[PDB]
Amino acid sequence: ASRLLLNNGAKMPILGLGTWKSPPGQVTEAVKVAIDVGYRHIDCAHVYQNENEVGVAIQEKLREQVVKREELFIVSKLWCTYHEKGLVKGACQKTLSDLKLDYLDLYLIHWPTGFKPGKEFFPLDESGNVVPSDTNILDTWAAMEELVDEGLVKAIGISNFNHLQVEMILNKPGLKYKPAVNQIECHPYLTQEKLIQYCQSKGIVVTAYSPLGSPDRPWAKPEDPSLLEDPRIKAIAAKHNKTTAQVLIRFPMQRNLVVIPKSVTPERIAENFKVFDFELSSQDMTTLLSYNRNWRVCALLSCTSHKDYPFHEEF
Ligand SMILES: NC(=O)c1ccc[n+]([C@@H]2O[C@H](COP(=O)([O-])OP(=O)(O)OC[C@H]3O[C@@H](n4cnc5c(N)ncnc54)[C@H](OP(=O)(O)O)[C@@H]3O)[C@@H](O)[C@H]2O)c1
Ligand SMILES: O=P(O)(O)OC[C@H]1O[C@@H](O)[C@H](O)[C@@H](O)[C@@H]1O
């Protein structure tokens, strides 16, 4: 239960450490602490601008022999400005460089939406809108498949894909490698029952991101819902003598999901690990599910008119 079996035969640790918003000056210590504490799965991305510093931590713990490379499960993601078939290998290689590794365990397409290649992560026109690429999902998928054949990555997957977009890849003529993982937003306010049931029926593992509601998202507001401070969730935690964070992390785990909470605080990274040793009742689970309000932290709102925008479909 500490690891789930992927369709490529590998085993993915059900708990991982997230690194979006982890400042460069703090994330090396954060990752060293996590590995020491017993984390074996780190979620990364080129767009987080801190992979070099994550890589410093991974190298220090490998050199120290705290972990063997084979025990670690390192994830990164292909950013939207590199969807072109000819840019994919290079994007993967730059991430490998920064992280100081010679293969990734899992490489995800970060969003289904391709943007204009360039130095800008969000290329804008003079009208301030995001300039798309004309690339499609299937071509980018074909490029990702040959990363597997080249030995650069062990498995490939997708992130923020809706079920029709997953369908598209699954029905691709001559599909060689299925998506191993779809990483999506999921917590009590966005429970994702339909999509999770869809992916799990197709043998695709689901990873829940922003499990605590991403209280540090740069676009946060005061009137905004807060999971960590929902009295109903505080109550379920009190009953178990756990923290509301530990309840919010255990919740996806009991849905057979992988979950990747972010912290750069050593006490919280430790607190977040102690979630293997208790059980939410079925009443707790059904209750937590009933809190769904279809509320999204990450709606990629600047791309709502992109041909590949994922969140117009029901699921
Ligand atoms: N695929 C995608 O498009 C996508 C999108 C969003 C997220 N993700 C991944 O999912 C990871 C997690 O999502 P996220 O960063 O949005 O947020 P999250 O994990 O839901 O929340 C992180 C926030 O919770 C705080 N926190 C962590 N543990 C806590 C605890 N024990 N008690 C109180 N506060 C706690 C953290 O503070 P401190 O850090 O100060 O402790 C941080 O401010 C990301 O870092 C990224 O790796 C992927
Ligand atoms: O950074 P992620 O949430 O993993 O997804 C990628 C992008 O989407 C949102 O978060 C913002 O527009 C940026 O902070 C980021 O460049």
Other beta carbons within 10 Å of 65: 7
Region of 84 please: left (phi>0), alpha (psi -120 to 50) or beta: beta
For tokens 């789930």, name the residue: 4
Q: Mutate which of 162, 190, 212 to test ligand 1's pocket (most atoms within 8 Å of Cβ)?
A: 212
At 78 the three-state DSSP class reads strand
At 12 the three-state DSSP class reads strand
The residue extents of the domains of the chain are: 1-315
Query: Is residue 303 within 8 Å of residue 130, measured between CB atoms?
Result: yes
Q: How far is it, in rounded angstroms, from Cα 55 to Cα 100? A: 6
Q: Provide the resolution (angstroms).
A: 1.8
Identify the DSSP state of 204: P
Q: Whose CA is nearest to atom 16 of ligand 2?
A: 47
CA distances to 19, 20, 44, 74, 245 from 40, rounded to whole Å, are 14, 17, 13, 8, 19
Task: Give distance in angstroms: CA of 171 to centre of ligand 1.
Answer: 34
Region of 18 please: left (phi>0), alpha (psi -120 to 50) or beta: beta
Q: Per the annotation, where are the binding residues for NADP(+)? A: 9-18, 210-272
Task: Give distance in angstroms: CA of 6 to centre of ligand 2.
Answer: 26
At 135 the three-state DSSP class reads coil
Q: How far is it, in rounded angstroms, from Cα 145 to Cα 132? A: 23
Distance from first CA to last CA of the chain, Å, rounded? 27
Which among 47, 124, 83, 26 is positioned nearest to 308, based on CA atoms?
Answer: 83
Decide which of 3.40.50.720, 3.20.20.100, 3.65.10.10, 3.20.20.70 is the CATH code for 1-315. 3.20.20.100
Name the experiment that determined this structure.
Answer: X-ray
Q: Which residues have CB under 8 Å from 10's CB, separation 6+?
A: 73, 105, 154, 155
Q: How far is it, in rounded angstroms, from Cα 150 to Cα 134? A: 26
Question: What does 244-308 look like in DSSP terms, one character per residue?
Answer: HHHHHHHHHHTTT-EE--B---HHHHHHHH--SS----HHHHHHHHTT-----S---GGGTTSTT
Task: Give distance in angstroms: CA of 297 to centre of ligand 2.
Answer: 10
CA distances to 56, 108, 134 from 95, rounded to whole Å, are 13, 12, 24
Closest atom of ligand 1 relative to the 264 alpha carbon: 39
Task: Give distance in angstroms: CA of 258 to centre of ligand 1.
Answer: 14
CA distances to 109, 248, 249, 269 from 259, rounded to whole Å, are 18, 10, 7, 13
Question: What does 45-73 look like in DSSP terms, one character per residue?
Answer: -GGGS-HHHHHHHHHHHHHHTSS-GGG-E
Identify the DSSP state of 216: T
For ligand 2, is residue 121 a contact (CB within 6 Å)?
yes
Give catalytic status of residue 48 as yes or no.
Answer: yes
For ligand 2, is residue 108 a contact (CB within 6 Å)?
no
Closest atom of ligand 1 relative to the 77 alpha carbon: 1
